[PDB]
RNA sequence: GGAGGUAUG
RNA sequence: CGCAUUAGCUAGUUGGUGAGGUAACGGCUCACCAAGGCGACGAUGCGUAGCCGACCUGAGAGGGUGAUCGGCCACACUGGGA
RNA sequence: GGUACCUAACCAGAAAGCCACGGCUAACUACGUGCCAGCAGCCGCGGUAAUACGUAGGUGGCAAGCGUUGUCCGGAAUUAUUGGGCGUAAAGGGCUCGCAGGCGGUUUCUUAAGUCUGAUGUGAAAGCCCCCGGCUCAACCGGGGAGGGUCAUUGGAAACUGGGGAACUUGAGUGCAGAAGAGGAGAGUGGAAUUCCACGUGUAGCGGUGAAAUGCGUAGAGAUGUGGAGGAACACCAGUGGCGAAGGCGACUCUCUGGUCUGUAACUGACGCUGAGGAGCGAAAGCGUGGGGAGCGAACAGGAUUAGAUACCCUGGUAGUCCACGCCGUAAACGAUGAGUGCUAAGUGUUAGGGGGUUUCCGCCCCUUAGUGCUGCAGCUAACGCAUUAAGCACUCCGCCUGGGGAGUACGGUCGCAAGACUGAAACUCAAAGGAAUUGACGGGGGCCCGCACAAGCGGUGGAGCAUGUGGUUUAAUUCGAAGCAACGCG
RNA sequence: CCGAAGGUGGGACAGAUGAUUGGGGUGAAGUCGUAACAAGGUAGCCGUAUCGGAAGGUGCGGCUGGAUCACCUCCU
């Protein structure tokens, strides 16, 4: 995916300042965690560390502009039911109704919203470490599939799918 | 487990208990007995009115009565605000609340209710110290 | 010992498509043969083959991907154990990833899909979710 | 080149 | 509803014959026969509680409550009797 | 009740408080205070610059209310049916046998208990939900419906579960033919070595330690040769080798005896799996009775070491270790990994078989079972790692876990001669305890390397007199600063 | 005849209280040692027995959740 078609909009998730122990004392650092997306189906995050926060939250972006996916969006919500699972994160992701909006945990929100989903229900049933939650939410996305792929690989048509 | 082994033992929740017990407690004079009725607060009689040195890092001395409930209960309880008038005899009304530094410490004394006086010069937050309003 | 066939034929097709196996063999019998039927007619498996011999008979399925080798079966569970049957009735007949799969019900009409079951109004036994 | 055995602060 | 750190309980007890009694079937009571009945699918014992429509909570499954109003039950200083 | 409601006149006049403002969490400054006074739901604030204490100003959230406490649900997937786990974080019973129970291979017929389905009946009113209407609105009130059950009567369907009958052979077992094995019990036998006893030769120490001593020895030790007594254990073989359910089993021979593996398809034809409670087995220590007793060795004595040394070290040494019977029933009883079954890349050793390929063979190569190791895909895991011997993918059954202490404790019960074992809490208390991995630091850990670091030398200091600085003390003041290296002829 | 209450008697069960006593928990700075964490300076831990002011020591058996250096197999 080539980021400079897309309009992506971006998000610091978190900023966690992290130590190293040298001789003498402690040299610390800020890994930024920004999730980045067009808002029209795809969605990206990526890691950055530096000494400074703006640099840190930076190359976090170069990252996520490099891991886009693509998100399947039935109308304003996702084709049905998953549970987004990474290490310990575990998101489950449910399709909802028209005018619900997003009800999602911070994070997962994040993912959710800057992949222009508009409606649809999620619930982190396992660790709330912000990384964790987003690549299980990521990865649980990435499993969603759409109807009319389903069909073809199936060889039957839309209409006998959903019948 | 397996569905088999739940049928035969059931689950078996936590048993979550009271963080202040005393309070949970009635007394029926007629046959001696601790009744189980939840109260919001307790009127006791002060034996001991003394102070305290708080676990570390704190350091202080913080005021406390040994209070005998009216279910016979004896309960160690922290006198909030800026000097009290509680001695031996003193009628007072507890409620819950634990000082989080002073070991044994699970009740807090109401300013302003039975005997304890409102706090002298409290001008902020002066409901929970039972002051009436200045003019 | 082997308590539920049908479980372990599920499981075979699991494990056979998760290393994308081209075909699996099946020990056979009646029930698992039209839960065979069902996934080629429904579109999940290529073939299947019903080789006699003099024990119970093998059913060899031939396994279906797409193109850049993508598995058209993503999950299979199974719903009714023999620890805990699972029937249902014919309204509360549930639909497998919001109507994208299909669910295997024993009814006294046949081993139907969810779909076919719904149409007819009758409920019975959810063998499998097939996904 | 890697695994297993045989005094106070 | 809880407890197995409660495992055996029961002797009109469980059936039968007959009689008595009841608005009425019935060990409901008696007399005489037999030894049966209940229990690990939890009897018995202990503890706890009026039950419900409903009320609070929860996405739901559930959890808690059983005040006001309605239904049923039980009680009327304590025990028994008519 | 002259209440509601209506009309008229006068008057902004009588009618705003509570909590909070460090983060979670919307809302910051000044002063006082100085680990005191106090605050606190949690992290935590406060020890002379407090946005956390108290006050004041301002701001924020609500508002005739506002806070605190108490109780219930949620968040809590934190008892997980929906919807969790048990290698190392809490959690697999020490292991087997097995009653009840749970679960169960394939075909066909039948039945209709479970299962699905048609109709009928019923689930009061109020309440919740939907739609209307009346109180000036709202609360509230009223009308009409909807909704609700492992519900009952009566028909139907037969795929699955259950019951009955008849078949099938893969599971399981039997027969037949082979194979290995420290599997067990009993009875014998053998060689080495330690100790002791007797004797010959022989003389001054032997033994022991970091160094010594206690101890043994001229009463002839230790060393050396021959023979004898007795007890315990079985070098080499010997191997992530074998066998066993586990504990465990290692000299040889014989007696009795269990199990596993391979081939065969002769036979039975689902006869199977798991298994609470129960029964049996279960290292070492320990216990009872009676034997035995070389070595070893709790306790204990003495010699050392040490500030002390109720220890490590040394010289002795009792129970015990051994045997028979009985009891005890616990281990880091460990693979910290329950049993059964099936499925899912390979490479490579090794143990016991079978079949074959060129053969007298040897052998090499190929295949096949069943064990036992290593590496390693997919997959799994928090990570470490597991990976056809799973910790992967599934299904059946059993056991067990729900924060750390209190505590494997108290009470009760069962068992035991006793020691104790099994079962097994709570009050109270903390906001952690913990797993894996990472960075450094450290080690009386290892490796490598360097330095007036040591070594190889030279001359000093510490002693004396005095100069100077410092500490202490004395002073009216003995001004202030510097305090291991890195303060002290220093500013 | 049946029959409440009451009386006598011995047991069962539950609670309260009790001289004295036993550990347990928690506490801003106490005393004695230094048992564990590195090879923690005698590797540690588990069961058991015995001994000792105290941590603990020792014996028998077991485990690696043991450091350092040598040797035999396995794997790369």
Known sequence: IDPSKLELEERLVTVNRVAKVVKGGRRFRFAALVVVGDKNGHVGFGTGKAQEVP??????????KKNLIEVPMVGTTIPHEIIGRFGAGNILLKPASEGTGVIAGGPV??????????DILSKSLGSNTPINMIRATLQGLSELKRAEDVAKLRGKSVEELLG | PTINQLIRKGRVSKVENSKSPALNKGYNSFKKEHTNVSSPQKRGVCTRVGTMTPKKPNSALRKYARVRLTNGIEVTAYIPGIGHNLQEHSVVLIR???????PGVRYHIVRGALDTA?????????SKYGT???K | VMTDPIADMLTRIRNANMVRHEKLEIPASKLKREIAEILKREGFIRDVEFVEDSK????????????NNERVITGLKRISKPGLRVYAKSNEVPRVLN??????????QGVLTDKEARAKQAGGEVLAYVW
């Open chain 2, 132 to 134: 009436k309003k200045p």
């Open chain 1, 55 to 64: 640099e840190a939250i930076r190359k976090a972006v170069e990252d996520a």
């Open chain 2, 96 to 102: 819950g609340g634990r000082v989080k530094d002073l």
């Open chain 3, 99 to 108: 109507g994208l799969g299909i669910a295997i019900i024993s009814t006294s």
């Open chain 2, 118 to 126: 409102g706090v002298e010069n409290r001008a902020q937050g002066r």
């Open chain 3, 56 to 67: 119970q008979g093998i059913i060899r399925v031939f396994l279906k991907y797409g193109q």
């Open chain 1, 109 to 118: 929100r994040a993912v959710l919203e800057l992949a222009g989903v508009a």
